[PDB]
Amino acid sequence: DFILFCLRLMHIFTISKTLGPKIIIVKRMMKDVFFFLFLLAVWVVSFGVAKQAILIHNERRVDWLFRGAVYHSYLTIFGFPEWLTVLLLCLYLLFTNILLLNLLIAMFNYTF
Amino acid sequence: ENLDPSCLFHSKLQKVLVEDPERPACAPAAPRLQMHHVAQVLRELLGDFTQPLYPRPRHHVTFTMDPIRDLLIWAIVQNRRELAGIIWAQSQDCIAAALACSKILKELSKEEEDTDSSEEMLALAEEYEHRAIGVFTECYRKDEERAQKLLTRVSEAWGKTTCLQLALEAKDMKFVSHGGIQAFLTKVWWGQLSVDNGLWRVTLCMLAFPLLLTGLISFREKRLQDVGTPAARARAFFTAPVVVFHLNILSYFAFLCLFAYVLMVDFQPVPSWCECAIYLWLFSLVCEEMRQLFYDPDECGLMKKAALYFSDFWNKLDVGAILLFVAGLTCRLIPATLYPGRVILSLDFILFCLRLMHIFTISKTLGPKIIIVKRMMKDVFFFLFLLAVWVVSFGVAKQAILIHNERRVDWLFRGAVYHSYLTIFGFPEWLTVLLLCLYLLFTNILLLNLLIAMFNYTFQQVQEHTDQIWKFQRHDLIEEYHGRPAAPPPFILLSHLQLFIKRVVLKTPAKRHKQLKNKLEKNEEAALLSWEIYLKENYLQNRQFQQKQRPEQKIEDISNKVDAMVDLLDLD
Amino acid sequence: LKENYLQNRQFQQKQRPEQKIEDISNKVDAMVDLLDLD
Amino acid sequence: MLALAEEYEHRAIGVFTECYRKDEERAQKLLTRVSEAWGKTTCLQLALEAKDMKFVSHGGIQAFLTKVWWGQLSV
Ligand SMILES: [Ca+2]
Structure with a gap:
């Protein structure tokens, strides 16, 4: 989910x-x-x-x-x-x- | 009889006249021109798949059927352009006629041994394929369904061939690259069910048997979609060639995984069971390809069918892999050469995986x-x-x-x-x-x-x-999986056995299917041909009006009016 | 064959559109001179 | 002068392509012959020394070069 959050940038x-x-x-x-x-x-x-x-x-x-x-x-x-x-x-x-x-x-x- | 002597067709006719033995049976010095000589030299040009046009008598005025066809061939073979452009407008079924003229002109332009008339013949053939595209796109824009029906029908006027086969054998890229014929190929490829379901839906219905009984996927011809007869729906779903394609892909994938497993761990000097299942599946594949070779839907040359088979790339690759596996089993059977048999089977695994x-x-x-x-x-x-x-x-x-x-x-x-x-x-x-x-x-x-x-x-x-190139390539893949039985290569022996024991004793050798080629009834064919005639008459007026609207023609018209005016003022 | 080539060259040069425009212009100038002469 | 020279090489290309489309063999024979009127030189040597790209880039003269390159046997 940290990977998913950093994809949002x-x-x-x-x-x-x-x-x-x-x-x-x-x-x-x-x-x-x-x-x-x-x-x-x-x-x-x-x-x-x-x-x-x-x-x-x-x-x-x-x-x-x-x-x-x-x-x-x-x-x-x-x-x-x-x-x-x-x-x-x-x-x-x-x-x-x-x-x-x-x-x-x-x-x-x-x-x- | 009064055909002009300088052309190529007159030379080929004067050859085939004296190659007849029945004239030295009568008298050698006297040449008699018959009709079946013209039919023979026309059958050599048009192709082997069509039947002869003018029959031979086996024994007032008399008309043959469709005389405009005969006058069009006589005007086409000797490169008279403006006569053919006139008498094509009088023709009965123009869609087949333009493509047949294009095929004749291409084949006659190949053997020219000249330079000017060869380019003239190629330009005329390209013009006639443009005529066929124009009439078909009019028929397509008016009605969607009868335009599809116009392709698959058999034509009595041109030796019992369909229009699509002529367009393929004449190698016309721009005709089969049209949108409507590509939609026809997609419609055949999706088979019985509707074309709008998507791939993942067919994948899940392939994985799950009871999902087809639900409200999932799609259908057309909604007498089957509304009423629930799940045996008929399952037969229609498993009949469709997309499903047979995905079944063959999944069976081939499981075959490759089992081959890799037995090659990696179970290569044994003792004969093995996991090996013998794979020998069964490979014997299944080679019997399938032998059936694919022996299929002869019309009467055709066996060596010609052999060259047609070996011309294709994947057939060469498939038969090379079969030969290498045959060599590898004989290398495996000898105990001294077990490891060379192993490395041969590994290279054949590379050849099998290249097929994916x-x-x-x-x-x-x-x-x-x-x-x-x-x-x-x-x-x-x-x-x-x-x-x-x-x-x-x-x-x-x-x-x-x-x-x-x-x-x-x-x-x-x-x-x-x-x-x-x-x-x-x-x-x-x-x-x-x-x-x-x-x-x-x-x-x-x-x-x-x-x-x-x-x-x-x-x-x-x-x-x-x-x-x-790819749009022209698209056809033979669909035709092959239309011809292939539905079972995966495990059960394709059970499919093969009934066909093989049926063919030998009392059955037809091979017959085409009524989705690619069918013979219509007379009552339908008359209305269809009248509809196509009316749409051709509609197309010609738009063509001549567009040619009148060109600017250089307007300039030429003004110049002619000005010359008439200066002549009138000179006359005063 | 040279004599054959020269005729096709001059016919193609006659078929150009700007030359047709110039020919129409010369005919129109001849016509306005003729109507001025009357 | 450069425009006039380019126009004259266009004239040579046109006459040769007429001679080539009519007959295949005598058009090849027209190249290698010696010319008494222009100081005993052949046509191909003049086309090379004048550095005319579009003349030697024609299809028939390239077919002649292939025909010489394959020699006695068929190409
Ligand atoms: Ca195959």
Whole structure:
């Protein structure tokens, strides 16, 4: 409820001349923000499940390996195994560093 | 017989005359022009889906049915513009006629092997699709319902095809991008129930069985809405294709969760039960796609239907995932290759989860963005080659200067590769500052502006008509889920078995449904055609009045009056 | 083909609207001179 | 003088696009030929040395460059 109260302070910027239309713009942008973030979430879950399947055997560990792989996927999302590691990192680079970012740039520029 | 010789249609007719064997059966030197030769060369132009127009005799004056059709085709095929513009105004059912002329002119303009007449033919075809749009928008603004009824009807005059199929096969963007036909597609997509309920209401009625028996959601055709026959209401609710779409999405989601669970924990060398349920569901999916291939509503080419199936993107992706799963099971059955079978099934899980991106095509705002990304990937790839050779260049240069020659296999090589990866992901004082500032100047600036420029550039073009492409794309999704049975992929075997045992012994092969195509009665069709004739006569007057109101025409009229006046004053 | 091109060029230059306005103006000036001569 | 030169490159583009729309092959043959009247130079070399963007940006001459670039085999 403190978060809800502090959200109410954004109403102050409506009275000023230059600031209000930007708030009205953000109120429109949130709609396709949400439906993008679903697409991003299912994508990162897909690569997390694929990596934890290939590079770790089947183990019934409850909170150790699960939170470890989840923290690995979180660190990836926030930003002879030589050929295999280079292939996995370059595939994650090619997908994540490029495609959905241009999707966001295109959609946000379009609605703006 | 007196068609002019220089045109393309005369050349194709003179070929198909001598390709007939029945004339060397009679006499080789004498050519006899028959009507079914013209019908054959017209069937080659119009498409395979239509039946021949002029029949062959299997044996005073005599009229064929609808002679204005024949005169319009004879004026169209040899690019006489002003004759066609005159005798189109006399035509019976003009909506189908304009689109058929547009299809004929596009197909005849493709094979021209010239330059002037090809552009003339394309301009004429575009003009005729404008005529069809004008007459249909008059019929739409007057009455909402009969204008919808005018689309799905079969037309005897043009070889038993509907108007919508001609508009699709001729690839007319501006006709199907009209508001009324899009409203028709939405009306078919929402099915039996009313179109104003919203998505969350259908979601809650899908989750809750007794909520449909209440006063919730909506209906149209209020004989079912008022009187309570909940068996019929439930059959109508589960018949609708939106419901079948959400059921397939939910079943696919549960299938993916079970596949991820068995891949993460239950990959066993002994054959497993949670695996065999998934093999059952995947056999269900492949039998569904085989049924989707074998559907032939009209008589058509099997190889042509195969090219039509494999032309589509998601069919290629679906059959690739099926083939990879077939390979993965044979890799799983051999005990020596169990872990390669595991990694193959993981890559196939990636392929299955890529299929969930298809859901966003149906929504209004989201689909054009997918069409934009499908264009952007092409120069994405050729950029990433340039980025890779660049980072390899600085990695090799740095590892050459700051490390001596050592034959270490995996230690120093993976160390330098991890250093280059950490660089890519984001008195040695002067040298280190120089190396870091050089990597800063190159990496933090140049290729980033290359990406910004190229991506902005291609977005500025594809953004313009992604919407017009998507409105044309919208049809086949609705047609497929109209054709698909209602059961989710667990029970679609129970749906498939009755159809398969029925088709073999005594049934029809395939028949279209009476929502997309139907044959009207004569008593209704006469009044409908008279209504359309009267609205065409209404449209032509507004067109000629608007063309008279143009300013350049007023200037030309004043000039002609002034020339008449100076001639009159010269005569005095 | 050059002789073919020149005719299309001069016909397109004749079809311009400002040239039509100038032609109407010259005809009207000829007419007012003729009515002044009577 | 600059306006007159731009007008004359428009004249050259118009006559060449007529020759191109009528026949595809002889229009290609018209470029590479040597001209005795203007000191034994070809037309393409004059269009390059005069720096005319709109002449070499035409579709037919670009098709000629593609045709030379693909060489003996089909394009
Ligand atoms: Ca399919």
